[PDB]
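Quick one:
INPUT:
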């Protein structure tokens, strides 16, 4: 996260860190047994880390639980990131508590201008690299498709939305992928892609979760 702020320990209790020997992507707890993340974060041997703040220090509220099954969206396209969403089932249910908690799924989508909270342990520099230990947060509005497309010349689909600031300076970044975009109390986005970080006219692109709630619910019910 570039241009954001230190969340404060466990203030985003639905934020998880996906770990394969090191943090590599974020995710969001949906119930005691399931995490949602980005399909492009798929890999084998994932350990889900819940209740994290400093990802390099055991602070006492962590739960580490191995993934038992991963399900990449049926229509995920790795070239365009269309349908960049994946579900991860935990080998055992998380112990839910004030620091380890699920985030509500949307019952309707979010409109342009809606403010959201984006969070993660990704790069905090727009030029070069610095990776934080503690969770970072950023407040950012959803942009209209037309403004975003004309400003960025990105190719996006109806399963994506843009969020951030066209002036640059505030954006998600490398290492934030898979993590949450929460707007008015609902998980509306997953950190997906962009170009660079926090550059002028190159806002962040996010998986539009409200398009997937039926698939999420039926997938969980059946697995
Ligand atoms: C490749 O250069 C980067 O550092 C950024 C990191 C990143 C990751 C996620 C979000 C942001 C952001 N600023 N909101 C930045 N990656 C990318 O920007 C994209 N990775 S990418 O190059 O793999 C890629 C590019 C384009 C498509 C359609 C799919 C995948
Ligand atoms: Ca920790």
């Amino acid at each position: 996260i570039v241009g954001g702020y230190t969340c404060g320990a466990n203030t985003v209790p639905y934020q998880v860190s996906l770990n394969s020997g090191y943090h590599f992507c974020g995710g969001s707890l949906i119930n005691s047994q399931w995490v949602v993340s980005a399909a492009h974060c798929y890999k084998s041997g994932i350990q889900v880390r819940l209740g994290e703040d400093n990802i390099n220090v055991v602070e006492g509220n962590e739960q580490f639980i191995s993934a038992s099954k991963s399900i990449v969206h049926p229509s995920y396209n790795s070239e365009t990131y269309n349908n960049d969403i994946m579900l991860i089932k935990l080998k055992s249910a998380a112990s839910l508590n004030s620091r380890v908690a699920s985030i509500s799924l949307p019952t309707s989508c979010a409109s342009a201008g809606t403010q959201c909270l984006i969070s993660g342990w990704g790069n905090t520099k727009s030029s070069g690299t610095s990776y934080p230990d503690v969770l970072k947060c950023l407040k950012a509005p959803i942009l209209s498709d037309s403004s975003c497309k004309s400003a960025s010349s990105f190719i996006i689909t109806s399963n994506m939305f843009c969020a951030g600031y066209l002036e640059g300076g505030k954006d998600a970044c490398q290492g934030d992928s898979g993590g949450p975009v929460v707007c008015s109390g609902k998980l509306q986005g997953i950190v997906s892609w962009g170009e660079g970080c926090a550059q002028k006219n190159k806002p962040g692109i996010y998986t539009k979760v409200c398009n997937y709630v039926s698939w999420i619910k039926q997938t969980i019910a059946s697995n």
